[PDB]
């Protein structure tokens with residue numbers, strides 16, 4: 001311990017504050033009774049403020065460390081599967097065969113969505129973005145599932161969580177099928193979480209679909225690697241919304257919208273344009289998309305990350321998996337080889353070395369999905385569908401903490417009181 | 427400015443922190459730099475953390491002060507109209523006749539929603555809670571208005587502002603009409619904002635609907651009184667989702683859901699049900715409702731508020747408005763003597779006096795709304811509808827500032843790094 | 853006696869007896885049984901009528917509504933004074949009622965409608981249309 005005893009805040013006289021010690025990472029200064037004395041801190045963005053105590057995910061950016069209930073992301077990604085990882089994130093411990101089998105069975109038994117929610121899909125335009133459709137469908141669930149909205153009832157919370165974990169993939173695949181004009185595919189209980197997804201994504205009544213083991217395993221890993229990422233913007237949106245008592249589905253829709261957010265920029269969509277609509281080592285990785293990099297233009301595309309200093313721990317296995325996929329699909333991948341030239345640039349180009357634009361999990365996640373024949377508009381849908389369990393865990397944990405209602409202060413610098421006098425008459 | 431220049435935090439090294447001053451209210455200690463020094467606070471709920479710098483609304487909870495751009499709520503609720511208040515909050519000043527003309531004109535010519543959006547309502551169950559349908563349509567707006575989702579684009583913010591402002595009452599009236607099986611009503615370019623809302627809510631194609639000028643003003647007042655309420659939970663949600671790039675339509679949808687959070691909060695839902703049922707001037711007004719108070723659920727019933735100490739400043743104009751409406755609807759208000767008694771019990775019961783369960787603005791709004799024949803299910807829809815202008819202003823102020831993304835810290839107290847080995851074999 | 857029929861017969865053979873007055877021979881039963889199964893599927897447009905009812909409605913009321921709407925489609929078998937019409941009408945009712953019933957059920961709970969399968973008995977096909985789901989094949993317990 002350093003100065004993990006206490007501390008003093010002095011304005012004109014002292015104020016002794018406690019310091020809480022964490023099991024990992026930095027310890028914090030307890031300031032809960034401060035404002036209750038008038039004294040407030042100023043911190044837009046909360047980068048110097050701990051908003052909660054959590055035991056879910058630990059991250060050490062400078063060390064490139066990511067843990068889920070104490071387990072390193074690499075261990076879980078390689079020796080587990082999305083559902084077992086979900087069980088761990090939600091319960092805190094790994095399941096025994098009895099626990100896993102129970103959980104797994106409940107998840108599969110609720111994959112089918114109500115027949116009327118499917119009617120809602122047909123009211124959206126065919127030209128709409130799959131992500132927006134997904135947010136719309138998600139923010140519409142509480143109208144049907146009115147029987148599991150109480151965040152203060154464990155029964156409601158557990159049913160809600162299962163409804164999200166079971167149904168999100170089905171929704172996601174449907175946002176896909178509708179966008180391309182193909183018929184919706186029902187979930188099949190005999191197929192794994194990832195296999196059933198790939199099926200609902202690519203199945204067609206014209207012939208039975210064959211789920212490739214390497215693709216199924218690749219998908220499930222994309223899910224694991226996107227299951228959670230600690231107190232980020234999207235997760236904080238789930239916690240802040242739910243702190244007022246907002247239903248689960250409404251909190252998930254907001255998490256999706258937040259994870260969607262950074263892609264709305266005009267310069268973002270314009271660069272992703274060239275990344276997509278362009279295919280050749282002389283085309284993109286040759287002073288075209290490389291020279292056309294102006295304001296942000298990187299993390300969204302798989303380069304760099306504010307959380308990690310030198311590398312994204314999620315990229316290790318994702319890069320290993322990218323090899324296996326590119327190798328397996330071959331006759332359905334070799335053309336996408338430019339991934340090597342994009343990676344070559346991110347590691348050697350001075351612009352990328354200096355700005356620490358290392359390929360993150362999404363660089364390799366993107367290459368895999370593209371190779372599988374999935375469009376870019378569906379990538380974040382799949383990441384969000386994966387992150388939902390993390391949202392549930394953080395949301396469930398926020399409630400056990402007594403559902404602290406987000407009621408922040410403000411620094412008011414507007415007009416002092418003044419009288420209202422308007423001579424208009426419209 | 428006494429020592430409103432600086433102070434010091436003492437951990438292991440005496441770090442100086444500038445004391446930032448406001449134009450009204452409390453001062454704040456700028457701790458935005460502590461993070462870099464490895465020093466972080468702990469504040470679940472943010473009751474001592476100024477989440478931002480704001481100029482929109484100011485509140486002195488003990489002294490019952492509520493100012494919008496410096497202007498007192500009483501003067502706005504009596505002198506101004508809803509659209510002028512919208513302009514004031516959004517532009518920081520009362521409009522010139524010309525500026526008001528142009529503002530009102532823009533609002534009037536964007537009230538009718540895209541016909542494809544209208545077909546979404548028809549996929550929901552006729553028995554859906556109008557508020558769940560409202561959250562559903564608003565979250566579905568992004569798929570249609572994909573042309574104004576660039577939060578960093580000034581014109582997109584403007585169009586999205588006018589889109590939300592013009593259409594919310596259109597969509598809210600459609601929810602009600604859908605819930606009772608009556609045909610949707612189209613906006614009326616000749617009607618005022620409040621009168622148009624009433625027309626869309628109550629008229630049929632069967633006979634001409636003439637808006638009562640007294641109910642027109644009463645609704646205008648219910649709206650002005652719900653325009654904005656500073657940094658509350660739902661606005662904090664809107665701001666947080668916004669900083670993470672979420673589109674304006676999703677931000678407002680999150681706010682709507684976060685607003686009715688306590689309604690389906692288990693203990694609050696059942697409370698509204700008991701108030702809902704009886705109105706026979708013999709049960710409720712004679713300790714039927716009073717005897718049962720194991721859960722508070724009071725602010726929701728119009729009794730009390732965490733923000734103000736003695737009274738709700740917004741309730742001043744609403745109560746006066748409330749008795750006018752009742753008189754206007756003279757020989758029909760017989761079974762509604764419970765309102766005066768419930769009020770009396772709130773003013774004279776030692777328990778209500780003790781806990782300061784004063785009738786808040788929503789107590790009277792509820793009376794005005796119930797008197798108008800509007801079902802209780804539409805109350806929060808109406809409040810969120812009016813509250814939208816506040817949310818839009820707050821979302822905008824967060825943008826113009828510096829888009830400081832919500833990235834709080836977490837006092838980690840979970841498992842230390844532990845090795846993983848699958849217990850299961852499935 | 854009802855006990856004899858309930859124990860040693862089956863709904864379709866009992867139907868044959870009620871309608872004809874005598875028990876069927878193998879030839880008569882097989883003919884009747886086959887005609888009943890061959891008309892289990894209802895017109896695609898009658899199914900559209902199901903979607904116009906509210907999800908919250910009582911299955912029985914929906915059933916009455918669907919039933920009192922059949923003459924609008926089956927306008928070719930309304931004459932009660934024509935044996936041809938009467939026999940076709942009777943078969944239409946005996947074949948289609950279970951399909952309608954199961955659909956009033958599936959609609960009320962939000963599950964997809966299940967088509968009749970000719971390889972399943974009168975009761976087995978019903979249980980199937982009641983409890984089947986595209987998520988896996990249903991197993992009809994004997």
Ligand SMILES: NC(=O)c1ccc[n+]([C@@H]2O[C@H](COP(=O)([O-])OP(=O)(O)OC[C@H]3O[C@@H](n4cnc5c(N)ncnc54)[C@H](O)[C@@H]3O)[C@@H](O)[C@H]2O)c1
Nearest residue numbers: 106108109110111112113114159162163189962963985987
């Ligand atoms: N005990 C639990 O953990 C638990 C968890 C979730 C939901 N539920 C309960 O089950 C019902 C939930 O339905 P919902 O919200 O998932 O959808 P839903 O009921 O609105 O619509 C789908 C219908 O299909 C059924 N269904 C879904 N997937 C299926 C599958 N793979 N095979 C067969 N039938 C399938 C569902 O049971 C349901 O009747 C409620 O009664 C709810 O309380 C229970």
Ligand SMILES: NC(=O)c1ccc[n+]([C@@H]2O[C@H](COP(=O)([O-])OP(=O)(O)OC[C@H]3O[C@@H](n4cnc5c(N)ncnc54)[C@H](O)[C@@H]3O)[C@@H](O)[C@H]2O)c1
Nearest residue numbers: 532534535536537538539540541573584585588589613615
């Ligand atoms: N300059 C602005 O403030 C501003 C504000 C909002 C929208 N817009 C732009 O103008 C167009 C309007 O889009 P939208 O959101 O209104 O369309 P929409 O997709 O919601 O469709 C509604 C259609 O009805 C028209 N409309 C709506 N209310 C009307 C009324 N009361 N009287 C007559 N016509 C009415 C609209 O112009 C539009 O064509 C878009 O291109 C949008 O970008 C501009």
Ligand SMILES: NC(=O)c1ccc[n+]([C@@H]2O[C@H](COP(=O)([O-])OP(=O)(O)OC[C@H]3O[C@@H](n4cnc5c(N)ncnc54)[C@H](O)[C@@H]3O)[C@@H](O)[C@H]2O)c1
Nearest residue numbers: 887889890891892893894895896939940941943944968970
């Ligand atoms: N000879 C008879 O006893 C007899 C009895 C009933 C109906 N019919 C005749 O058959 C047609 C009646 O159609 P309906 O009133 O039953 O429905 P319908 O024609 O209005 O709609 C269903 C359609 O699916 C067909 N169908 C129904 N069940 C089927 C199954 N199990 N396998 C394959 N196809 C199937 C029907 O023949 C029909 O074309 C008419 O031409 C009618 O005259 C004949």
